Amino acid sequence: HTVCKSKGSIRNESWHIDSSEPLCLFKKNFTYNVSADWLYFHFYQERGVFYAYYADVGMPTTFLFSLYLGTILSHYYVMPLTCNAITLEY
Amino acid sequence: KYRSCLPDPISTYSPNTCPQKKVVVGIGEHCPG
Ligand SMILES: *[C@@H]1O[C@H](CO)[C@@H](O[C@@H]2O[C@H](CO)[C@@H](O)[C@H](O)[C@H]2NC(C)=O)[C@H](O)[C@H]1NC(C)=O
Ligand SMILES: *[C@@H]1O[C@H](CO)[C@@H](O)[C@H](O)[C@H]1NC(C)=O
């Protein structure tokens, strides 16, 4: 579970526990409009290639990125948020 | 979860019971296991 940057619990971090940096395949940062109402996302896979589309302004979405994994994705979670003052929809 | 796949999963008498199903590799994929 993830926490907020205003008033969190005692744990403050529950994503991973590994100390050493593991081998990765893709790690990037993107920017989005802060003064926005809704954020639209389109994730899918085809022939072992994972495609992702993102949009912050407007209803239609635009291409964001695409990578190669070689396997078949099975499950997905939401990582519930734990905060002290907060409304939150997904 | 816990478990017959006996005696072998390749030459099993009842393939509908063992969870290790027989599948083929598609396009742009690897051997599942
Ligand atoms: C993507 O941005 C995040 C911050 O939004 C970066 O994380 C920070 O990285 C710096 C430098 O490594 C650290 O000093 C901070 O402590 C990090 N903050 C957090 C919250 O982890 C991240 O490094 C960026 N990634 C890339 C590839 O640029
Ligand atoms: C963010 O959205 C607001 C209204 O939703 C708009 O006025 C502003 O120009 C947008 N900023 C960017 C950088 O898109």
Side-chain angles (χ1 to χ4, degrees), chain A residues 1-6 8-14 16-26 28-90, chain B residues 1-2 4-5 7-33:
Chain A
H1 59 264
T2 176
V3 303
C4 54
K5 60 181 60 60
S6 300
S9 180
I10 186 60
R11 49 264 295 185
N12 299 271
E13 181 68 21
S14 299
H16 55 186
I17 199 60
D18 59 330
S19 180
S20 61
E21 299 292 338
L23 62 155
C24 190
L25 190 59
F26 179 84
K28 285 296 298 180
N29 272 344
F30 295 91
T31 174
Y32 66 97
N33 193 8
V34 181
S35 59
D37 202 333
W38 303 85
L39 303 182
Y40 307 95
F41 295 94
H42 252 306
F43 301 96
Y44 66 96
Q45 60 179 357
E46 180 181 0
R47 296 182 178 180
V49 183
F50 183 82
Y51 303 83
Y53 293 64
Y54 138 86
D56 59 81
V57 50
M59 305 180 65
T61 62
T62 324
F63 183 82
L64 180 66
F65 73 97
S66 61
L67 77 163
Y68 177 80
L69 297 179
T71 59
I72 300 180
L73 300 182
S74 300
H75 296 73
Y76 65 96
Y77 202 23
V78 205
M79 193 66 60
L81 180 63
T82 298
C83 196
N84 294 19
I86 183 179
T87 302
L88 179 60
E89 299 181 0
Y90 185 88
Chain B
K1 59 175 57 180
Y2 302 92
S4 180
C5 310
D8 298 325
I10 177 62
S11 60
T12 174
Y13 186 84
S14 60
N16 196 24
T17 305
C18 184
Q20 302 180 1
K21 302 298 298 180
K22 303 180 60 60
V23 299
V24 299
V25 178
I27 301 180
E29 300 180 2
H30 295 63
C31 179

